[PDB]
Chains A and B, each alone.
Chain A
Amino acid sequence: DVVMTQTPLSLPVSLGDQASISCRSSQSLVHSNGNTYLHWYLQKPGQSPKLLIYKVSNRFSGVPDRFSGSGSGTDFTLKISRVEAEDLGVYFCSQSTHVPLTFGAGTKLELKRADAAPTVSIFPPSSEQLTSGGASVVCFLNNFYPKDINVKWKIDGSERQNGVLNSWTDQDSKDSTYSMSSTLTLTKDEYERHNSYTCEATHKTSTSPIVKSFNRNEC
């Protein structure tokens, strides 16, 4: 029942880099005999966890030898010597010393690549959508890097909202970019009640919100 803090959360690495995932406890993971149980797993998008190392530093049958664990008591470390493609996954540390058995939130090993600006498109609510009296204002924040991005909604000058759905792609397996969908859902009625609708995003690549818009009674 120990809180287990991983570091970092995202880790940009290049193929052949040396990655280092960190993991900490609130206690000490030392039993008496058997001794200090902490392990590492690798989950690949669409699979179960792969055991990599148990009890601080023992490889499992078949982990390539570029994976190492070290540490004692509080703070552990996973080194991954020449990061390859098949290493790219989520990394969890787990504590077997005390019941309940805890994990950390995981560290995503994601490909490294040059920053890139969001190509932001904006669509007003559809005709078929308004006969039904629903109003979806959606904007696609296509092909960016890195994933960290702040979107905001604005209705007539500036408001915020509540019917907001944000989906993100997995990293593009061709271009190493990410993408996002910001969707605002309003009643036909509230829609027909305001003119100016703005998705404005924030990225690393700018200190000026990427802004897009339409005015309703323009279409």
Chain B
Amino acid sequence: EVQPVETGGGLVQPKGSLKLSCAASGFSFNTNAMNWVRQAPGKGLEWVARIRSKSNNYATYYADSVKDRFTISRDDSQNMLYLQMNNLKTEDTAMYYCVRDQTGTAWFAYWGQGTLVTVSAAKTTPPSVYPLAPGCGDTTGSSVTLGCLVKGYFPESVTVTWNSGSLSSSVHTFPALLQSGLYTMSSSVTVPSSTWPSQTVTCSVAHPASSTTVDKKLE
């Protein structure tokens, strides 16, 4: 072991700048070769750039998609890697991981934890929490499915709890998806007709980033 430790990134606005940094307090950082790999929320892994050894004139290589905006650098002396990201695009939103290279193993051996980068011209906006009850698409079943709409919030960090008098979970939180520059997420509980309508389903929705706590009632 010796993990690459990455740091930086967070929210930054489009066109913004940001410098990401890899610590790899590990033995021979100077004769190695270091790379950066990202993953946009979802998708596969995408190579950003690598920078060679002292012994190769710290040569450099880049994905087309980042060339002219990103410069990879390192400072063998402290054992740090640097990613200087400039003139950001939203679609630079990714997890950035610095990869510990190796001659004799072969490329991408130890990957760090990652550092997340959200590039968005947005701001706090509290959840709009909407109750989704069986109304007048009939009535049909022994169990009944309810939901909560958690619409247009920012940044990500939400919480769907359901006050049900226990009476079966069957909870489904569908992952939040960018509609516009804010997020849309949902939740379904399945209860027994036995006791709902004639009882309660609370849908409690937390949002630390803006202290929001819309907790809704379904009836």
Contact = CB atoms under 8 A, between A and B. Distances in A.
B174 A180 contact: yes
Given A124-B137, A214-B137, A219-B136, A136 B149 contact: yes
A97 B145 CA distance: 53
Q: Is the interface of A mostly helix, strand, loop or mixed?
A: strand
Contacts, number: 137
Residue from B64, B97, B132, B185 having most chain A Cβ neighbours under 10 A: B132
Contacts of A67: none
Residue from A41, A55, A100, A180 having most chain B Cβ neighbours under 10 A: A100
Chain B interface residue bracket vs A: 35 or more
A76 to B, nearest CB: 13
Contacts of B62: 100
Interface in A95-147: 96, 99-106, 119, 121-124, 126, 128-129, 132, 134, 136, 138, 140, 142
A39 B106 contact: yes
B186 A54 contact: no
Contacts of B149: 126, 129, 136, 138, 183
Interface stretch (B7-15, B22-30, B80-88, B111-119): B111-119
A94 interface: yes
B107 A214 contact: no
A71 interface: no
Contact of A48 (B97, B107, B134, B185): B97
Interface in B104-136: 105-114, 128, 130-136
A103 B97 CA distance: 15
A165 B44 contact: no
Interface residues of A, number: 52
Interface stretch (B159-167, B175-183, B194-202): B175-183
Contacts of A70: none
B172 interface: yes
Given A105-B44, A181-B186, A183-B186, A167 B147 contact: no
A181 B174 contact: yes
B47 A128 contact: no
Residue from A106, A126, A163 having most chain B Cβ neighbours under 10 A: A126
Interface in A124-180: 124, 126, 128-129, 132, 134, 136, 138, 140, 142, 163, 165-169, 179-180
Contacts of A181: 174, 186, 188
A136 B133 CA distance: 13
A138 B186 contact: yes
B184 interface: yes
A129 B130 contact: yes
B76 interface: no
16 contacts: A37-B106, A37-B107, A55-B106, A94-B107, A105-B44, A126-B130, A126-B131, A129-B128, A129-B130, A138-B186, A140-B145, A167-B177, A181-B174, A181-B188, A214-B137, A214-B138
